[PDB]
Scaffold this active site. Structure first.
Site, PDB file in Angstrom:
ATOM      1  N   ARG A 174       0.848  -1.184   0.000  1.00 43.36           N
ATOM      2  CA  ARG A 174       0.000   0.000   0.000  1.00 43.36           C
ATOM      3  C   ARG A 174       0.885   1.236   0.000  1.00 43.36           C
ATOM      4  O   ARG A 174       0.898   1.995  -0.967  1.00 43.36           O
ATOM      5  CB  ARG A 174      -0.919   0.060   1.242  1.00 43.36           C
ATOM      6  CG  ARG A 174      -2.229  -0.725   1.172  1.00 43.36           C
ATOM      7  CD  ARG A 174      -3.106  -0.313  -0.029  1.00 43.36           C
ATOM      8  NE  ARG A 174      -4.036   0.795   0.214  1.00 43.36           N
ATOM      9  CZ  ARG A 174      -4.861   1.288  -0.713  1.00 43.36           C
ATOM     10  NH1 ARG A 174      -4.869   0.780  -1.937  1.00 43.36           N
ATOM     11  NH2 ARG A 174      -5.688   2.281  -0.420  1.00 43.36           N
ATOM     12  N   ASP A 216      10.681  -5.824  -3.628  1.00 48.37           N
ATOM     13  CA  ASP A 216       9.682  -6.518  -2.833  1.00 48.37           C
ATOM     14  C   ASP A 216       9.960  -8.021  -2.825  1.00 48.37           C
ATOM     15  O   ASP A 216      10.901  -8.483  -3.452  1.00 48.37           O
ATOM     16  CB  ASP A 216       8.284  -6.213  -3.392  1.00 48.37           C
ATOM     17  CG  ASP A 216       7.199  -6.332  -2.349  1.00 48.37           C
ATOM     18  OD1 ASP A 216       6.889  -7.476  -1.955  1.00 48.37           O
ATOM     19  OD2 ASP A 216       6.661  -5.286  -1.912  1.00 48.37           O
ATOM     20  N   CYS A 253       0.915   9.903   8.890  1.00 44.91           N
ATOM     21  CA  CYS A 253      -0.170  10.565   8.208  1.00 44.91           C
ATOM     22  C   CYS A 253      -0.898  11.497   9.162  1.00 44.91           C
ATOM     23  O   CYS A 253      -1.256  12.627   8.798  1.00 44.91           O
ATOM     24  CB  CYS A 253      -1.140   9.522   7.615  1.00 44.91           C
ATOM     25  SG  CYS A 253      -1.773   8.237   8.743  1.00 44.91           S
ATOM     26  N   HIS A 267      -9.996   7.551  13.087  1.00 47.99           N
ATOM     27  CA  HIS A 267      -9.201   7.026  11.976  1.00 47.99           C
ATOM     28  C   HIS A 267      -9.857   5.855  11.263  1.00 47.99           C
ATOM     29  O   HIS A 267     -10.547   5.049  11.880  1.00 47.99           O
ATOM     30  CB  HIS A 267      -7.829   6.593  12.525  1.00 47.99           C
ATOM     31  CG  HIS A 267      -6.715   6.670  11.531  1.00 47.99           C
ATOM     32  ND1 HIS A 267      -6.601   5.803  10.467  1.00 47.99           N
ATOM     33  CD2 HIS A 267      -5.663   7.518  11.439  1.00 47.99           C
ATOM     34  CE1 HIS A 267      -5.528   6.115   9.760  1.00 47.99           C
ATOM     35  NE2 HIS A 267      -4.940   7.152  10.330  1.00 47.99           N
ATOM     36  N   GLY A 302       1.388   7.940  18.756  1.00 43.16           N
ATOM     37  CA  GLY A 302       2.485   8.826  19.073  1.00 43.16           C
ATOM     38  C   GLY A 302       2.407  10.118  18.292  1.00 43.16           C
ATOM     39  O   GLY A 302       3.219  11.021  18.485  1.00 43.16           O
TER      40      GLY A 302
HETATM   41  C1  LIG Z   1       3.653  -8.605  -3.689  1.00 46.20           C
HETATM   42  O1  LIG Z   1       3.897 -10.020  -3.497  1.00 46.20           O
HETATM   43  C2  LIG Z   1       4.339 -10.506  -2.260  1.00 46.20           C
HETATM   44  C3  LIG Z   1       4.588 -11.906  -2.015  1.00 46.20           C
HETATM   45  C4  LIG Z   1       5.045 -12.386  -0.721  1.00 46.20           C
HETATM   46  O2  LIG Z   1       5.308 -13.718  -0.412  1.00 46.20           O
HETATM   47  C5  LIG Z   1       5.215 -14.739  -1.424  1.00 46.20           C
HETATM   48  C6  LIG Z   1       5.250 -11.438   0.329  1.00 46.20           C
HETATM   49  C7  LIG Z   1       5.011 -10.039   0.107  1.00 46.20           C
HETATM   50  C8  LIG Z   1       5.232  -9.040   1.194  1.00 46.20           C
HETATM   51  O3  LIG Z   1       5.310  -9.392   2.382  1.00 46.20           O
HETATM   52  N1  LIG Z   1       5.451  -7.765   0.828  1.00 46.20           N
HETATM   53  C9  LIG Z   1       5.724  -6.676   1.733  1.00 46.20           C
HETATM   54  C10 LIG Z   1       4.771  -5.503   1.559  1.00 46.20           C
HETATM   55  O4  LIG Z   1       4.381  -5.256   0.197  1.00 46.20           O
HETATM   56  C11 LIG Z   1       5.572  -4.346   2.146  1.00 46.20           C
HETATM   57  C12 LIG Z   1       5.233  -4.055   3.609  1.00 46.20           C
HETATM   58  O5  LIG Z   1       3.882  -3.612   3.704  1.00 46.20           O
HETATM   59  O6  LIG Z   1       6.947  -4.665   1.952  1.00 46.20           O
HETATM   60  C13 LIG Z   1       7.075  -6.014   1.461  1.00 46.20           C
HETATM   61  N2  LIG Z   1       8.265  -6.633   2.051  1.00 46.20           N
HETATM   62  C14 LIG Z   1       8.367  -7.589   3.037  1.00 46.20           C
HETATM   63  N3  LIG Z   1       9.609  -7.915   3.344  1.00 46.20           N
HETATM   64  C15 LIG Z   1      10.383  -7.123   2.506  1.00 46.20           C
HETATM   65  C16 LIG Z   1      11.814  -6.963   2.321  1.00 46.20           C
HETATM   66  N4  LIG Z   1      12.764  -7.632   3.014  1.00 46.20           N
HETATM   67  C17 LIG Z   1      12.503  -8.777   3.880  1.00 46.20           C
HETATM   68  C18 LIG Z   1      12.712  -8.448   5.370  1.00 46.20           C
HETATM   69  C19 LIG Z   1      12.282  -9.654   6.236  1.00 46.20           C
HETATM   70  C20 LIG Z   1      13.133 -10.933   5.968  1.00 46.20           C
HETATM   71  C21 LIG Z   1      13.536 -11.124   4.482  1.00 46.20           C
HETATM   72  C22 LIG Z   1      14.242 -12.385   4.056  1.00 46.20           C
HETATM   73  C23 LIG Z   1      14.646 -12.578   2.616  1.00 46.20           C
HETATM   74  C24 LIG Z   1      14.349 -11.519   1.594  1.00 46.20           C
HETATM   75  C25 LIG Z   1      13.642 -10.258   1.998  1.00 46.20           C
HETATM   76  C26 LIG Z   1      13.233 -10.058   3.444  1.00 46.20           C
HETATM   77  N5  LIG Z   1      12.241  -6.058   1.376  1.00 46.20           N
HETATM   78  C27 LIG Z   1      11.323  -5.357   0.659  1.00 46.20           C
HETATM   79  N6  LIG Z   1       9.976  -5.420   0.749  1.00 46.20           N
HETATM   80  C28 LIG Z   1       9.567  -6.326   1.695  1.00 46.20           C
HETATM   81  C29 LIG Z   1       4.562  -9.584  -1.176  1.00 46.20           C
END
Ligand SMILES: COc1cc(OC)cc(C(=O)N[C@@H]2[C@H](O)[C@@H](CO)O[C@H]2n2cnc3c(N[C@@H]4CCCc5ccccc54)ncnc32)c1
Ligand SMILES: COc1cc(OC)cc(C(=O)N[C@@H]2[C@H](O)[C@@H](CO)O[C@H]2n2cnc3c(N[C@@H]4CCCc5ccccc54)ncnc32)c1
Ligand SMILES: COc1cc(OC)cc(C(=O)N[C@@H]2[C@H](O)[C@@H](CO)O[C@H]2n2cnc3c(N[C@@H]4CCCc5ccccc54)ncnc32)c1
Ligand SMILES: COc1cc(OC)cc(C(=O)N[C@@H]2[C@H](O)[C@@H](CO)O[C@H]2n2cnc3c(N[C@@H]4CCCc5ccccc54)ncnc32)c1
Lengths: 358, 358, 358, 358
Positions: free
Chosen positions: D12, D38, D166, D194, D227
């Site tokens: 989002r 992502d 926000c 909210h 906060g």
């Molecule tokens: C859009 O499609 C998908 C598919 C999916 O799983 C199949 C998960 C998401 C999702 O959660 N998407 C999350 C969501 O859209 C947003 C948070 O609001 O950020 C996304 N997000 C979650 N973790 C990460 C990340 N690093 C993590 C930190 C945590 C550990 C870790 C380990 C190995 C590789 C990366 C990571 N980097 C960038 N964006 C992220 C989206």
């Protein structure tokens, strides 16, 4: 000596009050609902409207529709737990109501079209003895908030009483203990997150008096004014011109919350306030004012019959750590259920005192 | 030769139609909205109601309210993109409307109180030439669904036309192609998930006609009947007594879907149907019938002016793998927006035809 | 001989089932819930989650949290009506669970992460005797629907059972009688208007498997697929390849409705069907399949533990007047409540039979 | 010299920010979004997500998914108005991100997992030059609120910046003018109604941290902490320890309102305050702070990119007639839309200033 009462206007409020009577098991024994009056006399519809409620569920009593004379085409009598209630045809002027001919002494005015002392008095000209307006009244009718100023009720002077508004019945109790416990209240503003009501529209509709109020109720946060604030002034004289608030109508069928923000007269603390409200709730306010230590949400108050139930956690957690004058108190209320029980309480009280003073 | 039109009843439907005209950019040039009629002539309110809409947002045109004469207390004139619109006072009998005096030929009957051929003719007796009822009509009026049977309009025999219902304008097109492409339709039942309407209640209210329909709309799934099905029979002769359906009013401000289940006359495939609908949607149904290969949801169709937009994915994925007769076709429709654009279209058509034949 | 059951996964499903047991007054006496398993052991939280439900309300029992040893920092034991329930820590593989050491014979698998016959068997390797999956299962696990095919349960062969889905437990009963009463069922397509569930998102979120399912749940009508139909095939063999359906997720927290459209084998009437369902609901289907002649709405079925409650008025009023083969049947169901009771019922059934065959 | 930016986390928040870039028509020309990061690199799904938004509708630009090379199975490149955006696979530690290799200078940190100054700095170690966190940040990261304190941004000292919340971006403005116009502010408590967010639940779910926050969002009034108040203390030091507030999450997908109740330092009037806010909104706050004399409701602010839009009527109509100190100011804000625009603004500002100082 069954209190002979009659309901004028069998709508949300009207039915709620009736259901309140039955629920408390007063129907037949203590209170005698002689009849209800409305634009329709179809007992079968009312039966259906009482047996099923979207918010409060099914009633604990049995309701059945019957005919007064095998002659009539559609039922015009309501039978609850055996008691028979007449479904009288609605009238323009209350004075044209057969209250006298029916034996009705106490009339519960819940049509919302006779909120004026004068117009409401038509019920007395129709044979009634006393009138309780299930809403805020004008014209100078005595307003009472069970738990705060019922004692001020005079059987000889007050004939048209007002139970105030659902909202006022939540604030007044809090404000009462606030002033009674000498916390004082220099000034105060209150905001109320309220559930939408029957006067609102499902989709953007018409509302010449309240433009905003005419917008899609279930999909908008709709601000609005509220006399509930000033009103507390009539019930608690020392607060005249010291209070005022606003309202925010939000997407929920029932249950509202009050966010009171005020400045004390003397230094104090939020913990002192927190303990007082709880104490008062366990004593002189028990039944009217309650509290909670749990992490609750609106739905958790559905069917809670206390006029105002103070949110301890919410309050303790959202006030300045060391503040001594500027405070915020939070209390919930089931706008429909609680207010309903109060209406009944007021009637029973009035009935008793009217009888005692002879 | 601006089409002189008048709007009787300026509510949801009324404005929606007027907004459709302006939206299409016809206001002033192609269509001339001489005036609108309603229980109020407060142009300011109307301007408000038009400049702000919970579901459709802000209009693409400017709206301003002005006073016919500096003498009047409250505006009584509407000004959209320059064009001036008179705000006339409502009447009891359509015949008592100064249609002739105002120079209005086409009247859009959207009050919902004159859905009967007879009563609706009053407008003509009032000086009107033609009438388009923005709702299902009785009294034997010609029902027309653009893109299905407009051609059947006779400038000399049909004086009171009906644009059918928002729902019929959705099912009709689908059925039409289903018949025209010789798929044939033995029998068929259609369910419709529909957004709640202005006739519903925010909280359990009164509704003697449709008991369920009186229950809290935004928090229930409320079953109801619908003539939309049978009505298609008037628009598509070969379907009389073959179609019938029901409705389910759900908690959404706008946008509905149709779930048509039918049986073909000859062995075919859902793939065949799918391709036919899409073919038709790009051809003889373009503008009226649309489709989509995307995973959309109700919200995605807000402001979509197509009468019906077939859901390819939904359809292909939810049918019996090898079925040859029993099928399910799914299509959405912005029950408010689309229907409004069709009414205008219907008026422009009748106008162009009424003129051509002289 | 109190049945020794364990619950793996204490979420909506998990709790619901537990609450269903307590609610039926089986806790301690008939059923002995030795312990529940989940990512957390905070009994206080569990207590909170049980004492307050936005949709079902307050439980008819008393729940309190305590510590196994005054040594622990946070409660790890639930006390329902006196009965003590242990809060075991979750494991990666079901076989690593102390089911044997705990004395748990019947394990309710409601995590949703072990819907596969194989993986599910892990529990048994952990010391468990039988496993009942609170959801549709694969791997070839015997699927049962109370009131339709529980008699096909083999104590000696079936060690992993599936109580199917909430939607199936609603369709199966209807399809069951429709076939048993020899109405026949050539083919059929069912549409289900379902309330949103835990898997859905409040606001537009991520959903790589179900794109639509990832859209704001309480503000849209969201289509989706559902094996609930084909699944009825596993419970009722004679309907394999004959049934299929789709779903429509709509803005309600609970209670769903089933709209089954089907073609009979022989000529019959909607009245015949209507009578056959009621008759069955009052006899071999009582407890599982009920009906109603009232103008109800979703809310009216909350806490209705019947697997499927047929809507007579809806059905009779929305079918073709003289139709003989193409019919539509409407039935409601509390996707949360009812399903929970059946899971319990299934466990008791298996228990009784597993005990009978020694 | 297009600003080279990268988005870490495309959800989002992620998308809204990007869409805000495109919406303002800065894509390609002013800002060069080199790539997004992502857990998924499925451009088709992101494309879908950007083309269909329940609350904000369809975009004013085109979005298409393509393949970096015909060899890839699923699209991994986003194309908006001709500009190509790379979809990079996520990493545990920001420092493992190819920011340097991709040529990214400004990274917008919107995953919500690196709101800590130290962790967020990894982006720089990954090759980035600056980091803008789209949420409140800890670890001592400079927090800026466009329109209130951007001038305190130091190119050489601040490398990790936070755009606050926000809600803070709505309160800060008002408080800023309230102090700058010398109305002063002794103490103040703000309540915010909210809309529910992504962290909430559709149906009663799990939430160990925020217990109430785990309850059905679309059908409850859920109180929470915030906060946002204390946070305005860091942006406007003169208000440290003076403010504080609470939140009320209600059943709406977007648009929130702030209810500020404060006490002035010197005697004044609500009319005075009203005029000041309006004035400031037409001058030194234009673009950030806006106002409205109309009877608007939450839905009217959808897609309003002003940080905070003051409600004149609501304010002027709900205060004590002659109060001189205790006041209540009401202001709206599209929690999603607005905030997104501010994030962009901050980046541009930082970019401009970083460049200027060479
Ligand atoms: C859009 O499609 C998908 C598919 C999916 O799983 C199949 C998960 C998401 C999702 O959660 N998407 C999350 C969501 O859209 C947003 C948070 O609001 O950020 C996304 N997000 C979650 N973790 C990460 C990340 N690093 C993590 C930190 C945590 C550990 C870790 C380990 C190995 C590789 C990366 C990571 N980097 C960038 N964006 C992220 C989206
Ligand atoms: C239950 O069945 C129905 C059917 C119906 O229309 C068919 C309307 C209602 C409805 O609105 N019902 C109203 C609703 O339930 C509630 C007000 O919120 O009170 C009801 N109500 C409305 N007007 C009156 C009334 N007198 C009016 C005063 C004003 C003028 C006038 C003229 C002729 C006859 C009566 C009246 N007396 C008692 N109850 C009322 C209920
Ligand atoms: C815009 O301001 C208001 C104010 C108001 O009450 C104060 C009602 C409405 C409202 O309901 N408005 C209605 C609503 O927007 C829509 C129907 O859904 O049509 C509107 N409407 C209702 N009745 C009429 C009407 N004539 C009636 C027909 C029969 C009775 C009668 C008697 C005397 C004079 C006229 C009439 N003419 C035009 N529009 C109408 C709108
Ligand atoms: C009630 O308190 C909390 C707190 C929490 O996070 C802090 C998560 C949950 C939650 O998701 N709780 C889940 C939720 O209530 C329900 C599914 O709807 O089952 C719960 N659940 C999820 N995974 C498991 C599990 N094993 C997993 C299988 C996958 C791998 C793995 C690795 C290490 C440890 C465990 C596991 N065992 C039992 N219940 C589960 C509940």
């Amino acid at each position: 000596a069954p209190i002979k009462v009659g309901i004028n206007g069998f709508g949300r409020i009207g039915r709620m009050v009736f259901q309140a009577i039955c629920d408390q098991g007063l129907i037949g024994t203590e209170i005698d609902v002689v009849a209800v009056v409305d634009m329709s006399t179809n007992a079968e519809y009312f039966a259906y409207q009482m047996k099923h409620d979207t918010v409060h569920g099914r009633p604990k009593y049995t309701v059945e529709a019957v005919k007064s004379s095998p002659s009539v085409e559609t039922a015009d009598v309501l039978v609850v737990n055996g008691h028979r209630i007449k479904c009288v045809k609605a009238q323009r002027n209350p004075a044209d109501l057969p209250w006298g001919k029916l034996g009705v002494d106490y009339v519960i005015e819940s049509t919302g079209l006779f909120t004026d002392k004068l117009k409401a008095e038509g019920h007395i000209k129709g044979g009634a003895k006393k009138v309780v307006i299930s809403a805020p009244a004008s014209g100078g009718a005595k307003t009472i908030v069970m738990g705060v100023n019922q004692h001020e009720y005079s059987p000889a002077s007050h004939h048209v009483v007002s139970n105030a508004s659902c909202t006022t019945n939540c604030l007044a109790p809090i404000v009462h203990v606030l002033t009674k416990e000498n916390f004082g209240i220099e000034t105060g503003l209150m905001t109320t997150i309220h559930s939408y009501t029957a006067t609102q529209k499902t989709v953007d509709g018409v509302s010449l008096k309240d433009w905003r109020g005419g917008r899609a109720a279930a999909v908008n946060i709709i601000p609005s004014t509220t006399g509930a604030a000033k009103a507390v002034g009539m019930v608690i004289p020392s607060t005249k011109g010291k209070l005022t608030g606003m309202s925010f109508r939000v997407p929920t069928p029932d249950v509202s919350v009050v966010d009171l923000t005020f400045r004390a007269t003397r230094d104090t603390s939020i913990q002192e306030i927190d303990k007082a409200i709880k104490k008062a709730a366990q004593t002189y306010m028990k039944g009217i004012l309650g509290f909670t230590d749990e992490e609750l949400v609106s739905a958790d108050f559905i069917n809670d019959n206390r006029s105002s139930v103070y949110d301890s956690k919410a309050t303790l957690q959202n006030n300045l750590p060391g503040e001594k004058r500027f405070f915020k108190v939070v209390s919930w209320y089931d706008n429909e259920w609680a207010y309903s029980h109060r209406v009944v309480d007021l009637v029973r009280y009035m009935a008793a005192k009217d009888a005692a003073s002879s």
